[PDB]
Paper text:
BACE‐1 is a membrane‐bound aspartyl protease required for the processing of the amyloid precursor protein (APP) to form the N‐terminus of Aβ peptides and the protein‐soluble APPβ (sAPPβ) (Vassar et al, 1999). The beta‐site amyloid precursor protein cleaving enzyme‐1 (BACE‐1) initiates the generation of amyloid‐β (Aβ), and the amyloid cascade leading to amyloid plaque deposition, neurodegeneration, and dementia in Alzheimer's disease (AD). Subsequent intramembrane proteolysis catalyzed by the γ‐secretase complex releases amyloid‐β peptides of 38–43 amino acids, which form the pathogenic oligomeric and fibrillary Aβ species. Inhibition of BACE‐1 by low‐molecular‐weight compounds has emerged as a new concept for treatment of AD (Vassar et al, 2014; Eketjall et al, 2016; Kennedy et al, 2016; Timmers et al, 2016, 2017; Yan et al, 2016; Cebers et al, 2017) by preventing the generation and deposition of Aβ rather than just treating the dementia symptoms.
Author numbering: -2 to 156, 167 to 385
């Protein structure tokens, strides 16, 4: 039941949200990062200083070796391993056991994070971006094929350092959001690719050709902390946020995410910072809806006992050369429905949210733009 799935996610702020899973027979319990930005189920399978436990294939009678290596290098770090299949279950997910592909990580460099409490990654995106290639069926594809679970999942990421949330597999739990769910089409089934049609900072349009917001794609990624923007959009956004917050001046390093800004505990001047709205393409021509975030979402607290006389924050909007990434900055405080069956992503205000007494994060619409331009970059 969905009620049994509520609060099945845990994590440390900015370290990743994870769900408990079991692999093998007899079952081995592991904490697994929920990642909508990748498509491999990859688990630590050898000792590592940052791993409390790991997958021991020799203890699983149901393990099957696929006799195929896999090497996956990312911008920061890389993982090498071996492919196989085994029985997998989600103790606080659907009441089912399925056979799924598993990449057993045997060597890695700067992939596992100290103190993150996760031992692998559940890539929830599509086969097109699976490694080594699209013939390696992702976990959610196997789950849907082998069971009667509907082809949809939803995430309620709720932003001390400990975080929580819910991953609801096979449905939408109405207790997790308020107001209406607004849907944007999935443009291509690879990443969860979407289209942004307008960006406003404190109600002021950035006034760019909308293709700039999607250069070269825009994705929804629970495996990325920041709201990451293409260079041109990022520079305009920083200029606009600086203009709104000009009563206080911060080091250049802050706007580049290289330095923290600190205030005496409880004194953060939230009202000098603007709201940011991303307008997403609707399901109907030239209609859109907006997602509006507050500074409590894009100025992320950095927990550190040593600086705890203050509240210290990192600016969580950053530049990208690979397109827009709607990471946790966007997802936390919203209930996000990955409706794979209908090729669409829904957004609603979450039951767990940031609102202070002046402003509230929102999901609202509809908005019309009679300008007929397609905002898709490719
Ligand atoms: C597979 C890959 C990947 N992701 C992570 N993620 C995290 O550790 C992480 N996750 C969520 C959050 C929070 F919840 F706070 F947002 C904070 C963190 Cl710090 C770690 C290793 C790794 F290889 C590739 O890199 C990206 C980012 C890719 F570049 F592909 F986008 C991705 N999506 N998945």
């Amino acid at each position: 039941s969905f009620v049994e799935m509520v609060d099945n996610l845990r994590g440390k702020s900015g370290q990743g949200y994870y769900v408990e899973m079991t692999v093998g027979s007899p079952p081995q319990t592991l904490n697994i990062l929920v990642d909508t930005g990748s498509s491999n189920f990859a688990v630590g399978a050898a000792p590592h200083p940052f791993l409390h436990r790991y997958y021991q294939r020799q203890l699983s009678s149901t393990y099957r070796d696929l006799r195929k290596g896999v090497y996956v290098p990312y911008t920061q770090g890389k993982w090498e391993g071996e492919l196989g299949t085994d029985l997998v279950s989600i103790p606080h997910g659907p009441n089912v056991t399925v056979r799924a592909n598993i990449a057993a990580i045997t060597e890695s460099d700067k992939f596992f994070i100290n103190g993150s409490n996760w031992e692998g990654i559940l890539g929830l995106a599509y086969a097109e971006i699976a490694r080594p290639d699209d013939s390696l069926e992702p976990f959610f594809d196997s789950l849907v094929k082998q069971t009667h679970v509907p082809n949809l999942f939803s995430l309620q990421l709720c932003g001390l350092a400990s975080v929580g949330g819910s991953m609801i597999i096979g449905g939408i739990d109405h207790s997790l959001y308020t107001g209406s769910l607004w849907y944007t089409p999935i443009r291509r089934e690879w990443y969860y690719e979407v289209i942004i049609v307008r960006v406003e900072i404190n109600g002021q349009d950035l006034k760019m050709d909308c293709k700039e917001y999607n250069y070269d794609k825009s994705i929804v990624d629970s495996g990325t902390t920041n709201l990451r923007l293409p260079k041109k959009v990022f520079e305009a956004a920083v200029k606009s946020i600086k203009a709104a917050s000009s009563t206080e001046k911060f080091p250049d390093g802050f706007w580049l995410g290289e330095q923290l800004v600190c205030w005496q505990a409880g004194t953060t001047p939230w009202n000098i910072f603007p709201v940011i709205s991303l307008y997403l393409m609707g399901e109907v021509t030239n209609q859109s809806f907006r997602i509006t975030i507050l500074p409590q979402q894009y100025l992320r607290p950095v927990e550190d006992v040593a600086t705890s006389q203050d509240d210290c924050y990192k600016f969580a909007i950053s530049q990208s050369s690979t397109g827009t990434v709607m990471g946790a900055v966007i997802m936390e405080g919203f209930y996000v429905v990955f409706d794979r069956a209908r090729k669409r992503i829904g957004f609603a205000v979450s039951a767990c949210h940031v609102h202070d007494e002046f402003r509230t994060a929102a999901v609202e619409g509809p908005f019309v733009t009679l300008d007929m331009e397609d905002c898709g970059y490719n």
